[PDB]
Amino acid sequence: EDLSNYIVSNIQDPLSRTKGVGDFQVFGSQYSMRIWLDPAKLNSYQLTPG
């Protein structure tokens, strides 16, 4: 995840606009701010994922 993120965030854009480089496809992703809802902890406050 750390290396993937390093690719998408520092190596992709310069590669993708590199003379001759056309399509590309990363074997991984960049980081995202992930939020894992707890169905029971959510219930305890009468709250919804909405």
Added chain:
Amino acid sequence: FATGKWEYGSPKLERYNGVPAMEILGEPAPGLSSGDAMAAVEEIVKQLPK
């Protein structure tokens, strides 16, 4: 419910090839050469914040 402070920020955020940046435009010394003036700038970039 709200207060205000004074920070510092830029009124013109440029970027080159998908990355923050700052354009620099000058000339050569009257009589030298447009080719020469660039031998210089190649040297200046040496002592720049890695």
